Amino acid sequence: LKKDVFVPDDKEEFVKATILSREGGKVTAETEHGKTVTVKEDQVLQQNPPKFDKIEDMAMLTFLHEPAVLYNLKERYASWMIYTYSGLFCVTINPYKWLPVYNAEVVAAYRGKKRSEAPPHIFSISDNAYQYMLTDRENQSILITGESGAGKTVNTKRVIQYFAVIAAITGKGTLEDQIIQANPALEAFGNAKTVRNDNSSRFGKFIRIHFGATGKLASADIETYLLEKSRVIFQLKAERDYHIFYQILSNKKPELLDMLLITNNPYDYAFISQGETTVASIDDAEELMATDNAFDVLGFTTEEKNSMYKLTGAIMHFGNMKFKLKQREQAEPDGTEEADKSAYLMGLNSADLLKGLCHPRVKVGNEYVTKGQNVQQVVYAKGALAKAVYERMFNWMVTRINATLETKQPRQYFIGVLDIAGFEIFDFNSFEQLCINFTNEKLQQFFNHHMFVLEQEEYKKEGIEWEFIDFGMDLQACIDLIEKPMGIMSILEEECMFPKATDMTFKAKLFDNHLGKSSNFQKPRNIKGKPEAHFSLIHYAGTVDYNIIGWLQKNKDPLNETVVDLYKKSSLKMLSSLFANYAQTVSALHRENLNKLMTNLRSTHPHFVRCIIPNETKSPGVIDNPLVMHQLRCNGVLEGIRICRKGFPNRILYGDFRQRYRILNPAAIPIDSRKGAEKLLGSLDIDHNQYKFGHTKVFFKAGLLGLLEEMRDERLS
Ligand SMILES: Nc1ncnc2c1ncn2[C@@H]1O[C@H](COP(=O)(O)OP(=O)(O)O)[C@@H](O)[C@H]1O
Ligand SMILES: CCc1nc(-c2ccc3c(c2)CC[C@H]3NC(=O)c2cnn(C)c2)no1
Ligand code: VO4
Ligand SMILES: [Mg+2]
Secondary structure, eight states: OTTTEEEEEETEEEEEEEEEEEEEEEEEEESSOOOEEEEGGGGOOEEEOOGGGOBGGGGGGSSHHHHHHHHHHHHHHTTTTTEEETTTTTEEEEEESSTSSHHHHHHHHHHOOOOGGSOOOOHHHHHHHHHHHHTTTTEEEEEEBBBBTTSSSHHHHHHHHHHHHHHHOOOSSSSHHHHHHHHHHHHHHHOOOOSOOOEESSSEEEEEEOOOOTEEEEEEEOOOOOOOOOGTTOOOTTSSSSSHHHHHHHHHSHHHHHTTOOSSGGOOGGGGGGSSOTTOOOHHHHHHHHHHHHHTTOOOOOOHHHHHHHHHHHHHHHHTTEEOOOOOOOOSOOSHHHHHHHHHHHOOHHHHHHHHHSSSSEEETTEEOOOOOOOHHHHHHHHHHHHHHHHHHHHHHHHHHHHHOOOOEEEEEEEEEOOOOOBBBSSSOOOOHHHHHHHHHHHHHHHHIIIIIIHHHHHHHTOOOOOOOOOOOHHHHHHHHHHSSTTTTHHHHHHOOOOOOHHHHHHHHHEEEEEETTTTTEOOOOOSSSSOOOOEETTTEEEEEEEOOTTHHHHHHOOOOOHHHHHHHHHHHHHHHHTTTTOOOHHHHHHHHHHHHHHHHSSSEEEEEEOOOOOOOOTTTTTOOHHHHHHHHHHHHHHHHHHHHHHHOEEEEEHHHHHHHHGGOOTTOOOOOHHHHHHHHHHHOOOOEEEEEEEEEEETTTTTTHHHHHHHHHHHO
C-alpha cells in the first residue's frame, strides 16, 4: 500500500514504517521497531511491492532510492543470495562463509546463458564477457572493486575457476590445473594478515586469460604491481609478515626447518615477529602443503623450490644480525653466527658480507674508498637488502609462473581480471596506503568515466535527444592533486633529487603548495593515544591521515651496492639471477603502471563487480547499515542504476539489427538497413517510445531488447 514506506534513522540510515496520518507537510508513522515518528513529506520514500522482493536486477524496481537498494540487498543477503545486478553492473556482499554456489554443476549450467536467464553470479559476469569477446571480436576486462576485505581476490579466483573448469569439460598439470594453482603460490609470498583482512593482497594484479579465434582457452599471464616490501622487515601491532614465514615455521615439513637452520619459533626472528604470529582463521601447516603443492603443479623444480625456501630462511637470519660500535662512529659485527647462517643459504662469504655492510665502497674514478657506517646505517642497509631479495624473489616467481602458463596455442583475444589492493585506513598510514588508496580512487574514476561520461557522450555523438545529467561522480580534483605536476607525487619525486631534503622540507613543500589551495588536501585530525599524522587527503571512500616520515627513502629505495655485487657473484644460481640486471623512483613507477593500465583498459569492454564488506567483525550474515550505505554511496551504485533506467543501455548497428530481427516481420523488409530497421520496428506491437534512432545505431530503453529476443525465440520455434 501507499502506507508502507522508509523513514531516515540515526543508527540504521533508514527503517521501514507504516504511515498512520498526513498533516501540514508532515507524515506520522510507526517504524516496524515500534517507534512512532513524525517526519517531513520529502523524507518519506516508498517501499516497492512484494513482487519486487529479492529482485535479481535493481534497475527493474518501481521506486529507486537508497533504502530500496539497501533493503533489496539486505533481503537477498539474508537468503545467502550474495550477487545482485544493479543495471549493467553487479554488486556482491561478502558472506564470510562457504556457500554451495560455486561447484562444477553450477559452472556448467551458466555456460552460454544470457544474464537474465540465470541468477546473478560471478560465473555469469565471466560467461557474458566471453560471449561479447567472440561476438564483438574484442578484449574484455572484469574490474572488481572494493575496500580491503570486500572479496575482490575471492571473486578474481572464481572468474579464473570458471574458465578453467569450462576448458576441462609446461609443468606437472594441464593449463587449467596450473591457472588454479597460480594464486595459492603468489598468496603465500604476497598476502598477509592486516586488521581488515586475514588474507590481505599486498600487491595488485592483472590476470589476462587468453583465447584463440574460436574461443578455446589458449594461455594466461599475470602482471603484479608494487609488492609491499616494507612488510618483510616491519609489522604494525595487529598485523603479520607474509604467510610463507609462518607456513615454514609450522614444522609441517621438518626437513625445511633443518635445511634453513631455523627454530620452530617465529619470536626468534626479529624481521617477522613485530606484530602478530598466528591467525585463528588460518592453518599455516595445511597452507604450507597447499603452497608446496602449487609449486609442483606449476612445474617448479626441487632446486627452484628449495632456493625460494633457502632465501626465505636467509632473510630470517639476516634480520637477526647484530652490530655494535667499534671501540676508539663506526659499526662492527656483534657476533657472526647469524651472518654465517644467512651467507651459507645465500651462497656468499660471511666475512665479505659483513665487511660490505659495514664498509660500503664509493667509486673515486678507477679507485674506490670505503664509506663509514654507524649501527643505524648498517641496520637500515641490512633491512633494505632483505626487502630487495624478497621482492626480487617474488618477481622471479611471477615470471616463472608466466613461463609455465605460456602454451603452444595461438591467441586472438583475452579477458583481463583486475584485482587491486583495496582501500584501507590504518592507525598509521604511510606511503603504501597513499599508493593503495590512490589506485582505488583511479579505478572508481574509470567507473565514473565509463558509466556517466562516455555513456552520455555516446547519445550525443549518435544524435539521440538527451539532456546531460551531472551525477556528482568525478574524482579528477583528488586524482590531479596526487598525480599531476606540482601534486603530491611530483613534489616527493622532486624532493628526491635534492641531497639536503628532509621529511620536513617535503612536508613544508606539500603545505606551501596545497594547504588552502587544493580542496582535497587538508590538515590532519590527531587524537590522543593514536599516531601522529602530517596531512589528510579527502579520498572518494573517506578522509585518510598520512604520516610522511621516511617517504623520501621509501621513494628512492637506495641499496648497499657492495653487497648487491656479492649477490651477483653468488654460488646460489637464483640469487645471482635475481640481481643479474641490477645497475626510476617508486612513485614514478606507480604513476606509470596506473597510466599504462588505464589506457589499456579503455581498449577493452569493461565489466564491473562491486564488492561490499558487510561489517567490521568478519561476521557471516550481519549488515552494518551505515558501512554498507557508505560503500554504495561512494561507489555510485544508485547513479549507475539511474543512467540504466534514464538512458539507453542497449544499441545495435542498423545492419546487425536488420539481419538478426528481419524474422520478426519479413513482409516489412522484402532498401537501406536504416529504413528497414525503422519500418521493422514501427510494424511490431511494442511501445514505440522504448527505442530511439541514432546516426549508426538503434538505441533501446531497458527491457525492449529482451522482449525482441523472446519474440525471435518464439518465431524460430
Ligand atoms: N564470496 C565469498 N565467499 C566466501 N568467503 C568470502 C567471499 N568473499 C570474501 N570472502 C571472505 O572474505 C575474506 C576477505 O576477502 P578477499 O577476497 O581476500 O578480499 P579483498 O577484496 O581484500 O581481496 C576472505 O578471506 C574470505 O574468508
Ligand atoms: C597499477 C594498478 C595497481 N597498483 C596496485 C597497488 C599499488 C601499491 C600497493 C599495492 C597495490 C599493495 C601494496 C602497495 N605497495 C606500495 O604502496 C609500495 C610502496 N613502496 N613499494 C615498493 C610498494 N594495485 O593495482
Ligand atoms: O585486503 V585486500 O586483498 O583488498 O588488500
Ligand atoms: Mg585481495
